[PDB]
Amino acid sequence: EQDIYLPIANVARIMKNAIPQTGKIAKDAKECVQECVSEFISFITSEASERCHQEKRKTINGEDILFAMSTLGFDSYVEPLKLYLQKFR
Amino acid sequence: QDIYLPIANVARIMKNAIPQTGKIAKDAKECVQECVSEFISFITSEASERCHQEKRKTINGEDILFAMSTLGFDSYVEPLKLYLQKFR
Amino acid sequence: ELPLARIKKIMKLDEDVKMISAEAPVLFAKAAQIFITELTLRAWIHTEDNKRRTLQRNDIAMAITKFDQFDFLIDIVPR
Amino acid sequence: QELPLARIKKIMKLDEDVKMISAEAPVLFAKAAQIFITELTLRAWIHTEDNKRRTLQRNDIAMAITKFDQFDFLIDIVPR
């Protein structure tokens, strides 16, 4: 399997929560976003694996993810992401 | 301070373990809910001991499975290990 | 079947516990499934002895007495 | 959870340089993916509302990708 994707139903419902209840979403549109999400994860992963691998570490940790986020233009995501981690700790 | 798994989740596992005509009293589900937390805390504290003695910091799979066999749940170790090989 | 975040919180009631691995809550989730299933089944034996259809707290306390595996639960479920 | 962590782990291991993963990494990615899905959908919906439509279309998502530098890495994923 090269390419794997999150289940279309999970992606679809998050999409439905991000628009008014009067909105409808085309089939192609969900699948498009489903593909983008896998690309987004692989994108961030590839930077984190580099930063991790270069501290001769073997496992990608939280810092490497958030570090990769800021590096690749998703620094605005880092602020909530740290909040998410607090609650489970 | 004392945490319990959701009573509905406990009830579902209990119901799959009984005949199709069987019912569970409110008393029984809540009782099992307490036992399950006690079971986790029980195994954990032995695992933390095994963990600390090898001057480890984080409790890993082996520390759990060692604690299982040490504390009388050796019958769990083989299924748990197979269960911790398909997801890996 | 069981939320791992809640299992993690139960683990960290132990004060000699503060950091946990990824695999510990997954082991405990399945272990908790087996434990709930075994304890319920073992208690159902007494439900059947009284030809009842409702599993009662009486049955679980009974099963705890008749298995050495549940010794740590004698002060948790008294009769 | 809202997104399966096990599936996120599989996407992570498409990279040759990843073969063991930490506990928090897939959890971070679950929330990040939810935020990302929300961000991309929201941006495409703004183009839908500006055109007084009620069906979000793939055309709209391709549009939102072009108009934000944050989505540059998605330029060859949805083409025109």
Numbering used by the authors:
A (entry chain C): 52 to 140
B (entry chain A): 53 to 140
C (entry chain B): 42 to 120
D (entry chain D): 41 to 120
Paper text:
The transcription factor (TF) NF-Y is a nuclear protein that binds the CCAAT sequence in promoters with a very high specificity. The NF-YA subunit, once associated to the HFD dimer with its A1 α-helix, recognizes and binds the CCAAT nucleotides via its A2 α-helix and the following Gly-loop, inserting in the minor groove of DNA.
In this study, we demonstrated that suramin, a polysulfonated naphthylamine derivative of urea, inhibits the DNA interaction of NF-Y with the CCAAT box by binding the HFD subunits, either as isolated heterodimers or in the complete trimer. The NF-Yd–suramin co-crystals belonged to space group P212121 and diffracted to 2.7 Å resolution. The refinement converged to an Rfactor value of 22.2% (Rfree = 27.4%), with a final model composed of two NF-Yd protomers (identified with A/B, and C/D chains for NF-YB/NF-YC, respectively), one suramin molecule, one glycerol, one citrate, and 47 water molecules in the asymmetric unit. Furthermore, two sulfonic acid groups that decorate the suramin naphthalene moiety, in particular the one salt-bridged to the NZ atoms of NF-YC Lys49 and Lys53, match well with the position of two DNA phosphate groups, corresponding to position −21 and −20 in the complementary strand of the CCAAT box in the DNA/NF-Y complex. Furthermore, the suramin-induced homodimerization of the HFD heterodimers sterically precludes binding of about 10 bp present in the NF-Y/DNA complex.
